[model samples]
Target chain A: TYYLQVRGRENFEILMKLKESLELMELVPQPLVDSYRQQQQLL
Target chain B: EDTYYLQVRGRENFEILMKLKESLELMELVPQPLVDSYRQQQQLL
Candidate 1:
């Protein structure tokens, strides 16, 4: 149920945490997480 | 237009990223022990 493409499973944890943050009334956009995940993937 | 621009852009990027992140939830997420400790190490102002 991601709005953007995630690199792969390596990002699922962070993505899930991001969703949890959002779902828990914590404000955040997952795209930033996606962007950071992409950066880590390229490293 | 060059590496100078790239460096400035990158620095500005990190700054903005941090700013946007903080503006939203700095205080709320601070006490969440399970949250990313390094990500919440600063005060927005």
Candidate 2:
């Protein structure tokens, strides 16, 4: 699992893109992806 | 500690971490702290 804290829009966008790429490549766990998406929705 | 940070867990997740490193390299992003942590983990294996 991975936890990322984003401080600004720029960092958030970058991390989001990275997370997307990681998901596409199947490099990260599903829970992390789901959690990240949920965090994005809250922002 | 920086407000912008990342935390990863799981002891058996080293392979995934390596794959992530490869992915980050292709994306032209170097996560130095992760790299350092990975190296330390490698030493334990």
Candidate 3:
């Protein structure tokens, strides 16, 4: 997994938005979030 | 990987290093994934 890191600011912005959305939905949508996080990890 | 390698008391030199790293990566043609994976090895070469 060399070079498996990501620049924080760009993705973090989406994370912040997702966090707010999760709060509004009263659920984290764990499956979707987990998949997204995996993509984030890969990216 | 010296995230704690700071100077100026609270001004993180490592952060500067990482930022410099991002700039350096701009000139590299290696895979983007490789760049991220090897971030900690900034000084390897």
Candidate 4:
């Protein structure tokens, strides 16, 4: 699980995108999913 | 007009940010069988 705490609404949009990118694990192949998952863990 | 050439790095990175935002909005609305999963990440961190 990964989380981002943006300051204002403007920044929130960007944060959500980052969130969406993480959410993009299901469609892709396992290798790709794991790549993103690694970053999440790092976060 | 004066000829001016500017050299800078990191422009592409910013463009990628914008595209990702567009992608996020698009994905949230567009349903796809192969669409990715949106599991809530850890709390705000």
Model 4 clashes, total count: 1
Sort the candidates on DockQ, descending order.
2, 4, 1, 3
DockQ of 2: 0.18
Q: Give, for candidate 3 chain A, the lowest lDDT window spanning 10 residues.
A: A1-10
The estimated TM-scores of all candidates read 0.25, 0.30, 0.24, 0.28
With a 3 Å backbone cut-off (N, CA, C), the pairs that clash in candidate 2 are none
Report fnat in order of the candidates: 0.00, 0.37, 0.00, 0.00
TM-score for the A chain of candidate 4: 0.45
* Model 4 alpha-carbon drift over 4 Å, by segment: A31-43, B1-45
In candidate 2, stretches whose alpha carbon ends up further than 4 angstroms from where it belongs are A27-43, B1-45
TM-score of chain B of each: 0.34, 0.37, 0.34, 0.39
lDDT of 2 by residue, A1-43 (tens): 6664545455545555655554554666789979889999998
For each candidate, the alpha-carbon lDDT, in order, equals: 0.43, 0.57, 0.46, 0.47
- Pairs clashing within candidate 3: A2-B37, A3-B33, A3-B34, A3-B36, A3-B37, A3-B38, A4-B36, A4-B37
TM-score, chain B, model 2, is 0.37
Give candidate 4's chain B TM-score: 0.39
Best-matching candidate per DockQ:
2
Interface RMSD of each: 14.7, 6.2, 14.1, 14.9
What's the distance in Å from true for residue A34, model 4? 12
Q: Please, what are the lDDT tens digits per residue for candidate 2 over residues B1-45?
A: 124555445433434544654454354345778878888999999
